[PDB]
Structure 1
């Protein structure tokens, strides 16, 4: 969750030179980003998720 004692940093991406294309090739393209964990990743304290929401029983 969000607390100020364990802030974690920032991820930014910057144009290093440019995109250079020849003629009759579309300029505007798309980068896709993935995410995963390494082989030293670990979690500790069971709590309930803040996304599950129920108002009445599902019938």
Structure 2
């Protein structure tokens, strides 16, 4: 959850150089990002997730 006592880090991507591209090629491109976990990843307490937002039953 969002709190103040435990903050993690701030990913920030930066141009080390620019993008040098030759002629008759488009200028702009697309970078993708993936995410996963390493060998020592863990979770501890169960709860309900804040994404379930229902009102009544599903008849």
Runs (4 or more) in structure 1 with deviation over 2 Å come to: none
TM-score, normalised by the number of residues in structure 1: 0.96
User: Where does the alignment leave 5 or more consecutive residues of structure 1 unmatched?
Assistant: none
- Hey, which of these two has a bigger chunk of helix by percent? 1
Larger RCO: 1 or 2 (CA < 8 Å, sep 6+): 1
CA displacement, residues 1-59 of structure 1 (integer Å, 9 cap, x when unaligned): 11111000100000011000000011100000000001100000000000101100001
Cα root mean square deviation, aligned: 0.5
TM-score, normalised by the number of residues in structure 2: 0.96
User: Where does the alignment leave 5 or more consecutive residues of structure 2 unmatched?
Assistant: none
